[PDB]
Coordinates of N, CA and C and ligand atoms in Angstrom, one line a residue:
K1 N 41.6 155.4 14.4 CA 42.8 156.2 14.1 C 42.0 157.2 13.8
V2 N 43.6 158.1 13.7 CA 43.5 159.4 13.4 C 43.0 160.5 12.4
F3 N 42.4 160.6 11.6 CA 43.1 161.5 10.0 C 43.4 162.4 10.1
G4 N 44.6 162.3 9.2 CA 44.9 164.3 8.5 C 43.6 164.6 8.7
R5 N 44.0 166.0 8.5 CA 42.6 167.3 7.3 C 42.5 166.0 5.6
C6 N 43.8 167.2 5.5 CA 43.2 166.3 3.4 C 43.4 165.1 3.8
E7 N 43.8 164.0 4.4 CA 43.5 162.7 4.0 C 41.9 162.5 4.4
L8 N 41.8 163.0 5.4 CA 40.1 162.7 6.1 C 39.1 163.1 4.3
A9 N 39.3 164.4 4.3 CA 38.6 164.9 2.9 C 38.8 164.4 2.1
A10 N 40.2 163.6 1.4 CA 39.7 162.4 0.3 C 38.6 161.7 0.4
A11 N 39.3 160.7 1.4 CA 39.0 159.9 1.9 C 36.8 160.2 1.8
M12 N 36.6 161.2 2.5 CA 35.2 161.6 2.3 C 34.7 161.7 1.4
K13 N 35.7 161.9 -0.1 CA 35.1 161.4 -1.6 C 34.9 160.9 -1.9
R14 N 35.6 159.7 -1.3 CA 36.1 157.9 -2.6 C 34.8 157.6 -1.5
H15 N 34.6 158.0 -0.4 CA 33.2 157.3 -0.2 C 31.8 157.7 -0.3
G16 N 32.2 159.1 -0.7 CA 30.6 160.1 -1.9 C 30.3 160.3 -1.1
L17 N 30.8 161.7 -0.1 CA 29.7 162.3 0.9 C 30.0 163.8 0.1
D18 N 31.3 163.8 -0.9 CA 31.2 165.6 -1.3 C 29.4 165.9 -2.5
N19 N 29.0 167.1 -1.7 CA 27.9 167.7 -2.7 C 26.7 166.2 -1.4
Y20 N 26.7 165.6 -0.9 CA 25.8 163.9 -0.7 C 24.4 165.0 -0.1
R21 N 23.2 165.3 0.0 CA 22.5 165.7 0.0 C 22.6 167.4 0.0
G22 N 23.3 167.2 -0.6 CA 24.4 169.1 -1.7 C 24.7 169.5 0.0
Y23 N 25.1 168.6 1.3 CA 26.7 169.2 1.7 C 28.0 169.3 0.8
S24 N 28.3 170.5 0.5 CA 29.6 170.0 0.1 C 30.2 170.0 1.5
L25 N 31.7 169.2 0.6 CA 33.1 167.6 1.9 C 33.1 168.3 2.9
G26 N 33.4 170.0 2.8 CA 33.8 171.2 3.8 C 32.8 170.7 5.2
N27 N 31.8 170.3 5.2 CA 30.9 170.8 5.8 C 30.8 169.5 6.6
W28 N 31.5 168.3 5.9 CA 31.6 167.0 5.9 C 33.1 166.9 7.0
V29 N 33.9 167.7 6.4 CA 35.3 167.7 7.3 C 35.0 168.9 8.5
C30 N 34.5 169.9 8.2 CA 34.3 169.9 9.6 C 33.6 169.8 10.7
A31 N 32.6 169.3 10.8 CA 31.5 168.7 11.5 C 32.6 167.6 12.3
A32 N 33.7 166.8 11.3 CA 34.6 165.4 12.3 C 35.2 166.0 12.9
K33 N 36.1 167.3 12.4 CA 37.0 167.8 13.7 C 36.0 167.7 14.6
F34 N 34.9 168.4 15.1 CA 34.5 169.0 16.4 C 33.8 168.4 16.6
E35 N 33.0 166.6 16.4 CA 32.6 166.5 16.3 C 33.5 165.1 17.4
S36 N 34.9 164.9 16.7 CA 35.9 163.6 17.1 C 37.0 163.6 16.8
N37 N 37.6 165.3 16.6 CA 39.4 165.5 15.9 C 39.3 164.8 15.3
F38 N 39.1 164.1 14.1 CA 39.2 163.3 13.1 C 39.5 161.8 14.0
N39 N 38.9 161.5 14.9 CA 39.8 160.3 15.8 C 38.5 159.5 15.2
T40 N 38.5 158.1 15.1 CA 37.2 158.0 14.7 C 36.7 156.7 15.7
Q41 N 38.0 156.5 17.0 CA 37.9 155.6 18.8 C 37.3 156.8 18.9
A42 N 36.4 158.1 18.5 CA 36.0 158.9 20.1 C 34.5 158.2 20.1
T43 N 34.5 158.8 21.5 CA 33.4 158.0 22.6 C 33.3 158.4 23.5
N44 N 31.8 158.9 23.3 CA 31.6 160.4 24.2 C 29.7 159.8 24.6
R45 N 29.7 159.8 25.6 CA 29.1 159.3 27.0 C 28.3 159.8 27.7
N46 N 25.8 159.7 26.9 CA 25.2 161.5 27.1 C 24.4 161.0 28.1
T47 N 23.8 162.0 28.9 CA 23.7 161.5 30.5 C 22.1 161.4 29.8
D48 N 22.1 161.1 29.0 CA 20.2 160.0 28.3 C 21.2 158.5 29.1
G49 N 22.4 157.8 28.9 CA 22.5 156.3 29.4 C 23.1 156.0 27.5
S50 N 22.3 156.8 26.2 CA 23.2 156.8 25.1 C 24.4 157.4 25.1
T51 N 25.2 156.7 23.8 CA 27.0 156.7 23.9 C 27.4 157.1 21.7
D52 N 28.2 157.9 21.7 CA 28.3 158.7 20.6 C 29.2 157.8 20.4
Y53 N 29.4 157.6 18.4 CA 30.8 156.7 18.3 C 31.4 157.2 17.1
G54 N 32.7 157.1 16.9 CA 33.0 157.6 15.2 C 33.0 158.4 15.2
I55 N 34.0 159.0 14.3 CA 34.7 159.9 13.9 C 33.1 161.2 13.4
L56 N 32.0 160.4 12.7 CA 30.6 162.2 13.3 C 30.1 161.6 15.2
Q57 N 30.5 161.3 15.2 CA 29.7 161.0 16.9 C 27.4 160.1 16.9
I58 N 27.8 159.6 16.5 CA 26.5 158.7 15.3 C 26.3 157.8 16.9
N59 N 24.8 158.4 17.5 CA 24.8 158.5 19.0 C 23.5 157.2 18.6
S60 N 23.6 156.0 19.5 CA 22.7 154.5 19.6 C 21.6 154.7 20.4
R61 N 21.2 155.6 20.6 CA 20.0 156.4 20.9 C 18.9 155.7 19.5
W62 N 18.8 156.1 18.2 CA 18.2 155.7 17.4 C 19.1 155.2 16.1
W63 N 20.6 155.0 16.1 CA 21.3 154.8 15.3 C 22.1 153.0 14.6
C64 N 22.0 152.6 15.8 CA 23.1 152.0 16.5 C 22.4 151.5 17.2
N65 N 23.8 149.6 16.9 CA 23.2 149.0 18.5 C 24.1 148.2 19.2
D66 N 25.0 149.4 20.9 CA 25.2 148.4 21.6 C 24.5 147.9 22.6
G67 N 24.2 147.1 22.6 CA 23.8 146.3 23.6 C 23.5 147.1 24.9
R68 N 23.2 148.2 25.8 CA 23.2 149.7 26.8 C 23.0 150.7 26.5
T69 N 22.1 150.6 25.3 CA 20.9 151.6 25.7 C 19.3 151.4 25.6
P70 N 18.8 151.1 26.8 CA 17.3 150.5 26.6 C 15.7 151.7 25.9
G71 N 15.2 151.0 24.9 CA 14.0 151.5 23.6 C 14.2 152.0 23.0
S72 N 15.9 151.8 22.6 CA 16.3 152.2 21.7 C 16.6 151.3 20.1
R73 N 16.4 152.5 19.4 CA 16.7 152.0 17.6 C 17.8 151.1 17.3
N74 N 18.3 150.6 15.8 CA 19.8 150.7 15.4 C 19.5 150.8 13.9
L75 N 18.6 152.3 13.5 CA 18.3 152.4 12.1 C 18.7 152.5 10.7
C76 N 20.7 151.6 11.2 CA 21.9 152.8 10.5 C 22.3 150.5 10.3
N77 N 21.2 149.8 11.1 CA 21.7 148.6 10.8 C 23.5 147.4 11.4
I78 N 23.1 148.6 11.9 CA 24.7 148.4 12.4 C 25.1 148.1 14.8
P79 N 26.6 147.6 14.7 CA 26.8 147.2 15.6 C 27.5 149.4 15.7
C80 N 27.3 149.1 16.4 CA 28.0 150.6 17.2 C 29.5 150.9 16.9
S81 N 30.7 149.1 17.4 CA 31.8 149.2 17.5 C 31.8 148.7 16.7
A82 N 31.9 149.0 14.5 CA 31.4 149.4 12.8 C 32.0 151.0 13.0
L83 N 31.1 151.6 13.6 CA 31.4 153.1 13.3 C 33.0 154.1 14.3
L84 N 33.7 152.7 15.5 CA 34.9 152.6 15.9 C 36.2 152.8 14.3
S85 N 35.8 151.8 13.2 CA 36.3 151.4 12.8 C 37.5 152.3 11.9
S86 N 39.3 152.7 11.2 CA 39.9 152.5 10.4 C 39.0 152.9 9.1
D87 N 38.4 151.9 9.1 CA 37.4 152.0 7.3 C 36.4 152.7 7.4
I88 N 36.1 154.2 7.4 CA 35.0 154.7 7.4 C 33.5 154.5 7.2
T89 N 33.5 153.2 5.6 CA 32.5 152.6 5.3 C 31.8 153.0 6.6
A90 N 31.5 152.9 7.4 CA 29.6 152.4 8.1 C 29.3 153.5 8.4
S91 N 30.8 154.5 8.9 CA 30.3 155.5 9.3 C 29.7 156.5 8.7
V92 N 29.8 156.5 7.6 CA 29.4 157.4 5.5 C 28.1 156.3 6.5
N93 N 27.8 156.0 5.3 CA 26.7 154.7 5.1 C 25.9 155.1 5.7
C94 N 25.5 155.5 7.3 CA 24.9 155.4 8.3 C 24.4 156.7 8.3
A95 N 25.5 158.3 9.0 CA 25.4 159.3 8.0 C 25.2 159.8 7.1
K96 N 24.8 159.5 5.2 CA 23.4 159.1 4.4 C 22.0 159.2 5.1
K97 N 22.4 158.4 5.6 CA 21.0 157.9 6.5 C 20.4 159.2 6.9
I98 N 21.8 159.8 7.9 CA 21.2 160.7 9.2 C 20.1 161.8 8.6
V99 N 21.6 162.3 7.7 CA 21.6 163.5 6.9 C 20.4 163.4 5.6
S100 N 19.9 162.6 5.9 CA 18.3 161.7 4.9 C 17.9 161.7 5.4
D101 N 17.7 162.4 6.7 CA 16.3 161.9 7.0 C 14.6 163.4 8.2
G102 N 15.7 164.4 7.4 CA 14.3 166.1 7.0 C 15.7 166.4 8.1
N103 N 16.2 166.8 9.0 CA 17.0 168.1 9.7 C 18.0 168.6 9.0
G104 N 18.2 167.5 8.0 CA 20.2 167.9 7.4 C 21.0 167.4 7.9
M105 N 22.1 168.5 8.0 CA 23.1 168.7 9.7 C 23.0 168.7 10.4
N106 N 22.1 169.1 11.1 CA 21.4 169.2 11.5 C 21.0 168.8 13.0
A107 N 21.1 167.9 12.5 CA 21.2 166.4 13.6 C 23.0 166.7 14.5
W108 N 23.6 166.7 13.6 CA 25.1 167.4 14.7 C 25.2 168.4 15.0
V109 N 24.7 168.0 16.3 CA 24.9 169.7 16.6 C 26.0 170.8 16.8
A110 N 27.0 170.1 16.8 CA 28.4 170.6 17.1 C 28.4 171.5 15.3
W111 N 27.8 170.7 14.5 CA 27.5 171.3 12.8 C 27.1 172.7 12.9
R112 N 25.4 173.1 13.4 CA 24.6 174.0 13.3 C 25.8 174.5 13.8
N113 N 26.1 174.6 15.5 CA 27.2 175.7 16.1 C 28.0 176.4 16.1
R114 N 29.0 175.7 14.8 CA 30.5 175.5 14.9 C 30.9 175.6 13.8
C115 N 29.6 174.7 12.8 CA 30.0 175.2 10.9 C 29.0 175.6 10.3
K116 N 28.0 175.5 9.9 CA 26.9 175.9 9.7 C 26.9 177.3 10.3
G117 N 27.4 178.0 8.1 CA 27.2 180.0 8.4 C 29.0 180.0 8.0
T118 N 29.3 179.1 8.0 CA 30.9 179.8 8.4 C 31.4 179.1 6.3
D119 N 32.8 180.0 6.8 CA 33.3 179.4 5.1 C 34.0 177.7 4.9
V120 N 32.8 177.1 5.3 CA 33.5 176.0 5.0 C 34.2 175.3 4.1
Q121 N 35.1 175.7 2.9 CA 36.3 175.7 2.1 C 37.2 175.5 2.9
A122 N 36.9 176.0 3.8 CA 38.7 176.6 4.1 C 38.8 175.2 4.6
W123 N 38.5 174.9 5.1 CA 38.5 172.6 5.3 C 38.8 171.7 4.6
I124 N 39.1 172.2 3.2 CA 39.2 171.4 2.6 C 40.5 173.0 1.2
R125 N 40.9 173.0 1.8 CA 42.1 174.0 1.2 C 43.5 173.4 1.1
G126 N 43.5 173.6 -0.3 CA 46.0 172.8 0.0 C 45.6 171.7 0.0
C127 N 43.9 171.0 -0.5 CA 44.1 169.0 -0.2 C 44.1 168.6 -2.1
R128 N 44.9 167.4 -2.6 CA 44.4 166.7 -3.3 C 43.5 166.7 -3.6
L129 N 42.5 166.4 -4.3 CA 41.3 165.8 -4.7 C 40.7 164.9 -5.4
Ligands
LIG1 NA1 20.7 151.6 19.6

């Protein structure tokens, strides 16, 4: 599913991301935009052989099981395919684990490079929430 901007903001707010670990909703919307272009079925193979999955491009090296990333962990205890659903529950619950891990949202390279330090509120402007 390809979410619209305000559609995803509202969904992310219902799933508990607004201000989660101090990150305002616009941070999460900005990250999703640049990770996946709001597409829950986005996948990207990394050169280390791991794969990123879903609207927040969560990586199989640490976070989910895909059966083809040797020596990896599955810290969110999910198949990676769960991160591709139209239902964002698995992606949100796993993102909550990631952002709690010590480096905050810096774990998302696209957030650090394209969202961090910007007026992320623009991402939720004009939305009903
Ligand atoms: Na894994």
